[PDB]
Ligand SMILES: C[C@@H]1O[C@@H](O)[C@@H](O)[C@H](O)[C@@H]1O
């Protein structure tokens with residue numbers, strides 16, 4: 102059993118990040134895979150570079166919004182499958198933002214804005230590339246091109262929080278020369294977090310984080326024992342698409358979003374919440390609504406969201422409650438509460454609501470809700486490690502979806 | 512019995528916007544705050560002094576309703592807190608003319624609705640926390656209630672209807688409905704009268720009764736040989752009707768679209784509720800849902816207004832249903848997925864036979880409303896079976912409830 106390296110410990114403390122999809126596809130507003138899935142003429146699609154003005158991209162506003170939502174890092178698409186680069190590739194390619202009307206290195210603006218807000222900037226990079234003929238016609242030269250594009254990101258922007266490698270949809274059993282790619286990154290960015298969405302045996306010793314599906318039930322895989330500890334991360338997009346998709350109406354509820362964030366922490370993973378920017382780089386109004394709601398929850402949950410860790414304490418039969426541990430406190434995360442009415446106005450939260458947990462062995466002095474500081478009544482059986490709390494319902498006018506009670510030990 | 516013409520017009524409205532706005536909105540902890548949080552009445556009622564309506568724009572509200580595909584708006588003219596959003600002409604000092612706003616907000620509302628061709632409806636609470644008449648002199652309370660409705664009848668031109676909230680009352684009491692409703696008929700013969708305690712109906716003059724969102728089957732239209740009464744369901748976006756800043760428990764936009772579709776399926780109208788801010792703005796969160804709902808209702812316009820339930824059921828294990836207009840049937844199809852390509856599998860790609868029982872006429876063509884794609888189908892006319900291949904959504908889109916129009920031979 103190994104402990105995480107410092108940089109990975111810092112990663113796990115980040116808790117929540119914002120994922121941002123923005124590319125030429127954003128102009129179409131029919132999903133980021135539009136070029137392949139809608140079988141578009143490549144030449145015609147790539148003309149979208151000519152109208153890429155970034156007229157409404159404001160990295161400062163984006164970093165401010167991330168800070169307000171309680172995110173501690175942002176993963177930006179620096180190049181997606183379409184193969185267009187949002188930064189100055191310094192001669193590697195003409196299909197980049199410096200050859201577009203915007204004439205701005207957007208990654209430079211992004212990194213500066215993240216630093217001002219104390220956020221870690223992370224760079225998403227797609228390894229499956231539809232633009233360069235090298236990908237199909239000269240794979241070894243493709244690897245050189247890929248590696249050079251990452252090298253620019255390693256050398257021109259100062260210290261980088263990390264890299265988010267999307268290795269899906271690739272040729273099977275191809276040699277990707279990961280030792281050389283990740284070795285290069287270690288050389289110029291020793292402190293960078295390397296995230297892989299095909300990191301599972303790990304695909305390379307240098308991988309720091311592996312991605313997992315958001316529905317994963319139990320605590321995630323941290324690597325083979327006595328080997329390097331690897332962290333985990335789940336992702337959620339607000340509708341069915343990652344890039345903006347105007348007529349995708351199938352948005353998840355804000356409630357499900359909050360439950361997914363809580364769930365990530367419960368299984369010992371970070372969570373990225375994704376937004377797709379408009380063609381010109383604005384946060385769309387729908388995404389703002391979700392960020393405002395999530396922000397209210399994460400501000401309330403701040404005592405536990407960053408430092409809280411899974412612990413072997415389970416909830417009683419038939420509840421979805423769980424516990425997170427910090428060094429000073431335990432926190433009960435309680436679901437399926439209702440609002441409290443009054444007298445003959447019954448909203449469902451009114452009755453005594455005993456919620457039990459097994460695995461707490463220390464005597465407790467006080468338990469209180471984070472949102473209003475109400476003190477809860479409880480009983481313990483120290484021998485069996487049972488805690489039962491009366492989990493009162495929400496004050497009329499409020500509903501937190503996931504309610505957190507802080508335990509103060511004697 | 513078949514609906515009277517004003518009720519038929521009501522059923523064609525399909526979708527309305529419900530708007531909760533009162534003094535409670537300044538608190539942003541739900542519209543029942545005065546009772547449920549056991550406030551001192553005097554202290555709560557000081558909220559009149561800061562009721563500026565500084566951001567209330569009836570034109571913006573009517574425009575938003577038009578854009579979302581709503582055909583009427585129900586505005587709270589007086590809620591349980593008992594404060595009136597219009598000039599009561601001396602009936603009460605607890606009204607907007609005694610607030611800094613100094614505007615008859617109902618007048619602005621009615622003008623804005625007419626401009627956009629929307630019907631204005633007035634919600635009126637009958638359980639009132641402000642006037643001591645309610646408990647101390649019930650007969651005088653009835654007169655006060657009736658007078659407050661009379662002002663709404665006589666001062667604003669023709670009104671689309673009244674939405675009476677009769678919940679939480681004293682159960683035994685004689686409310687003198689024939690007189691109250693009778694007065695409305697005299698002033699506003701064509702007004703729709705909606706009652707949320709309309710159920711035997713509570714009075715012959717009731718036109719519409721309310722029902723729970725979750726009602727599974729087609730709603731109750733009144734006893735045979737009796738006046739037909741329409742139905743209406745309501746949905747609020749979170750758990751509260753007035754604005755509630757720390758209520759994060761919003762329903763998904765998908766559930767909102769499904770609820771709208773469901774209401775039509777059971778032969779009811781649907782109200783989607785928004786709570787305004789203290790100063791009368793539509794909050795940003797509500798704007799998002801309206802824009803998403805608006806995209807769906809624009810696509811569904813051929814069926815959303817005139818479509819009616821019909822005895823055609825869907826096959827085992829699906830939630831699909833059919834709506835009938837005089838020229839077409841429409842298949843409303845749920846649980847579809849997005850179509851990928853080649854090795855990119857999103858779940859909607861395979862042939863997806865969806866069947867219906869009760870279609871007896873030969874069909875010429877079936878096509879999706881969103882993109883005009885023609886669907887393949889087979890029929891067994893003797894058993895009245897229709898089976899369509901319900902293709903999945905084009906990548907980049909997802910309508911939640913997809914609608915196919917049937918064109919008959
Ligand atoms: C993060 C998401 O997952 C990757 O596999 C991509 O294929 C998607 O377009 C999106 O970037």
Ligand SMILES: C[C@@H]1O[C@@H](O)[C@@H](O)[C@H](O)[C@@H]1O
Nearest residue numbers: 542543676678707745752
């Ligand atoms: C639509 C709802 O109707 C009544 O039941 C009121 O008690 C609520 O506050 C709300 O106005």
